[PDB]
């Protein structure tokens, strides 16, 4: 605070006080100087305290209000991301089998656990060992859930392609053994 009315009034009070001190006037003049100095101090108090008090509240209001603007921007970004994910996900399902089994239903509501059971287009099978591999997906094709599936590509744990001819009793203890078998729907 250096450009306030109290600043100027205290400055001229000090000018008068120092002028009369250098003049060396009566003690009553000294008392007048002391009174002027003291009223200049009090006038300078609020004009150098109130503005500082308002400064902090103005600054904190600025900070809170910037934070609110940032919040709104983040909200917009997440909304756009969510809706674009929904729309990009839905467009890889509409097999007519879905319409078929929805219409055949009595009102429309069908349990969730059957939708991937009937309208799915690809099957993934995870296998613990060779013995289980025997009595399940044996040969180039097999059946499960009342349909025909033909094997297409087989990978190991480390995501390396494994040839079907390598899967055998004697060759078994040479592979990572969560074997993943991916297959398609034979119509």
């Amino acid at each position: 605070f250096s450009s306030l009315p109290s600043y100027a009034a205290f400055a001229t009070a000090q000018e008068a006080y120092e002028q009369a001190v250098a003049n060396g006037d009566s003690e009553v003049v000294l008392k007048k100087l002391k009174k002027s100095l003291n009223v200049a101090k009090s006038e300078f108090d609020r004009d150098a305290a109130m503005q500082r008090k308002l400064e902090k509240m103005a600054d904190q209001a600025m900070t809170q209000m910037y934070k609110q603007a940032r919040s709104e921007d983040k909200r917009a970004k997440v909304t756009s991301a969510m809706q674009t994910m929904l729309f990009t996900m839905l467009r890889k399902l509409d097999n007519d089998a879905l319409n078929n089994i929805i219409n055949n239903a009595r009102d429309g509501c069908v349990p969730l656990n059957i939708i991937p059971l009937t309208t799915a287009a690809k099957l993934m099978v995870v296998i613990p060992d060779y013995n289980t591999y025997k009595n399940t997906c044996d040969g180039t094709t097999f059946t499960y859930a009342s349909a025909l599936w033909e094997i297409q590509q087989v990978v190991d744990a480390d995501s390396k392609i494994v040839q079907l001819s390598e899967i055998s009793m004697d060759n078994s203890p040479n592979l990572a053994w969560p074997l993943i078998v991916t297959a398609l729907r034979a119509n």
């Binding site: 509240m57 910037y66 603007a69 921007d73």
Partner: protein, 590 residues
Amino acid sequence: AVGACVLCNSQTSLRCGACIRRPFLCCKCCYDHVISTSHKLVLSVNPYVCNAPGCDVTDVTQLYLGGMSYYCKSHKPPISFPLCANGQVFGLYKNTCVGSDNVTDFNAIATCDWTNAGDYILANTCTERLKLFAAETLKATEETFKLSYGIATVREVLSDRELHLSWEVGKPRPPLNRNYVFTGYRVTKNSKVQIGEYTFEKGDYGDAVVYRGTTTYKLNVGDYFVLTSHTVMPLSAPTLVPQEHYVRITGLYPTLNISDEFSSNVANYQKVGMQKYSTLQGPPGTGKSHFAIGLALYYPSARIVYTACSHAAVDALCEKALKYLPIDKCSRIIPARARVECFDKFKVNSTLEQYVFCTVNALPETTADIVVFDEISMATNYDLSVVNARLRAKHYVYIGDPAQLPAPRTLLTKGTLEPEYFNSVCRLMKTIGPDMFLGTCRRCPAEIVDTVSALVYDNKLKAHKDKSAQCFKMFYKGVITHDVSSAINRPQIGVVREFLTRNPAWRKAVFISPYNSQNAVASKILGLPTQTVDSSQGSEYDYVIFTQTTETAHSCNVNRFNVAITRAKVGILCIMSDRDLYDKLQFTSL
């Protein structure tokens, strides 16, 4: 949500309340605007009101920070500061408010009523962004006005296609045409549901109106048809792209030895190529849309899209392109409504084509290589930047003629508008001249070009064909309603009906009537090829019939008549009511 200012374009996030479009303003700019205008409402991350519920002061002149919110003096907390800054308004960003003073024009933009030509001419003189904002707010004003239109408190219905219309008292009962959109609302103490997109045109005879809706019931008594308004979207692209000069061709594929009428225009086509764009300023009838198809013949290789203002012009363009260019490389995009018919022979809205056509309001947001636009006079500056935003190509072509009639602009009821100030492009055309010009009206023979060049145009126009000796006139007045009910001259219709037999090849002469009621009643009586001027804009016919109803600022317009006569090919017969206007031309009277 933060942006730049407009006058100073500094980064800020303040908006005005009373300003209808609510634009971004900086601190100093907003302070100036609220000091000058009567706008006493500012928008920010929150509205500005006296937070005390016992007060409802929204004026920015006085508002006191009540800790975190705004207060009046009667509710101002002790330790609190008014938020009217030192000649600014307190808020988002103050340390980067660049100064700019051209606020007075901006204040006037948010002030005037758009009833005086000074408003419109001043609008087309400010900063680009200010021009866009003015066009946007004008469009919004028009939408608000047309919203406050008639509420047809009807009472009777004739048929499944025909009904009786009656209206309320106080609001403007709008005219009836296929252009407008209406819908009835079932007032049954509830269920005020839309009855469908209902269009309306006046019936054939008497107190009869023909009604057609998207759904069609047999309408009841208590309903009403209110005109709703469509929203206006903001835009960012410039109205006009900058010019750049080149040296060689800009990558276009020619066709050697294709035609002959356009090898002379090959120099003009290359002049277009050596720049980012080019325009066309010439009289109607003389290689306008025809300078177009040959130019396409010069470089018929790129995948392109075009359009036009109205439907007749684009349909004629489609026919011309079919005549010259191969059919299966061109398309015409149609709208969803399509209540007004179009080229009903071509591809039904095939956006996947090499040389595409469409209308102004149904343009897609794809791009092309070149493009041409029709009749800049009929268009505003808003749609120019609209197509600039949605479509961005490497070459642009614009056609137009200042002598043509401009867009309606119905709110301007005072004075005439100079042809240059029709849009920005017309001002540029009249100030810097054309890019290429053609002046020899080819469809009309020498007598018509002589009449138009002697009377309204400059004595420079010429033609290629001699007089066809099919000029005739008529002057007797007739009687009209004189009390609203736009003028209808029935005795002239009767005399035309009685006479026509003597004129053998005039049975299919294109009848002209700018007034909708006369336009309908003429076809109702006999069935001539009825037409209006507005819809004759950019058309052309062997046999035409023009009919002047009475005298008025509309019917006495020089531009209206001269654009009406530029559509004569081999034959025409037209009538007046005005003496000196009858004497002005240089044809045979009879």
